[model samples]
Target chain A: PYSSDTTPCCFAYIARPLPRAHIKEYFYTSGKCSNPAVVFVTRKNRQVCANPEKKWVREYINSL
Target chain B: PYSSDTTPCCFAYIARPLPRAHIKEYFYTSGKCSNPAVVFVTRKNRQVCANPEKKWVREYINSLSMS
Candidate 1:
């Protein structure tokens, strides 16, 4: 049986190891982490990531 | 007295004139248009435009100048 999991989780900033400066630089360009898959999941389970420059991908993500 | 245009108008794709090929390419990459200011206002008065790739600007637009 399928069940919904609505309980919120703590925000987690996931990223690959890198120099703090380089990570900050990447954030400047993308307005997000350098790795596309990496994101910050808020305490409420809201996922925050860099908005994509491409449209289709953005729409796709929003749909999810 | 001020009046609002609530009655929706026909959808308009407001964009700068460009080569057809270039426009098509932009639509492919940007999924809309390259011009940030240009957008498509739907007949229902819904505005369709490229989503910003930045957090601050995205939030600002969503706030409708309130921010």
Candidate 2:
């Protein structure tokens, strides 16, 4: 089993660009959620919720 | 932000039934992933991957009042 966030939904997101190097991996939140997001896991194990609509967010995800 | 699995993809699954009460929430792995699964988060924050095709998995998800 893979380890991940306890909550599978994102109620908020960070509008700023997160360093691609700091991002360890990412996963998509449930579509049923009101705020669909791409949850980025940092190298330090911090969960950073990002707006999927953002161009930078898309770039970061693909960079991973 | 909703807390959830660090890894969105599930490479494996548990065939055994999980107690519904122990599950706090769930989310879907990207369909782009090879092993598509419904990841169940336990109350203790343990990530349990379950086969989406299983009948019990569907029942448990409904039990959560999933939309």
Candidate 3:
């Protein structure tokens, strides 16, 4: 629950495909996911975070 | 003059410094500029595009506009 410093909702994105090991071994349950690595795509291409286990985050990102 | 196709509003961003030499060849004059390369910042670190001439885009991007 981010018991230490009170982690807040952080808006973020990424450039390319990074391995899970590269991503991390952390995050709050309410944290969020970085999925489809969505392309900054318009007419062609682009991308964001990748911590997919977070159901809330996945939908949130997609919902937007 | 894009007389062939319609290039409507396009949303975009960059993670780092992309020189204008890199940004374009063109766009709608109603087109925008990439600027500030804003960080996905959250009291720490992050970012976005780089073109600053278009006053509309600057304020728009700052106005919660996203790519």
Using DockQ as the measure, which candidate wins?
Answer: 2
Candidate of highest lDDT:
2
What candidate 2 gets wrong by more than 4 Å, as runs, is: A1-64, B1-7
Which of 1 and 2 is ahead in TM-score?
2
Best by TM-score: 2
> In model 3, which runs have C-alpha deviations exceeding 4 angstroms?
A1-5, A21-24, A28-64, B1-67
Candidate 1 accuracy as TM-score: 0.17
Reference-based TM-score, model 3: 0.19
lDDT of 1 by residue, A6-32 (tens): 111112222222222222212111211
Write one digit per residue (lDDT tens) for candidate 3, span A1-64: 1121111222333333333332222233232211122212222221223334455445544543
> Per-residue lDDT for B1-67 in model 2, tens only?
2333333556567868888879998877765455578889899988887888999999988887647
Candidate 3: count the clashes. 19
Q: Rank the candidates by DockQ, best first.
A: 2, 3, 1
Model 2 per-residue lDDT tens digits across residues A1-64: 2433323555567757878889888888765444577889899989877888989998887777
What local lDDT score does residue B40 receive in model 2, on the 0 to 100 scale? 91
Give candidate 1 regions above 4 Å deviation: A1-14, A19-64, B1-14, B21-67
Clashing pairs in 1: none
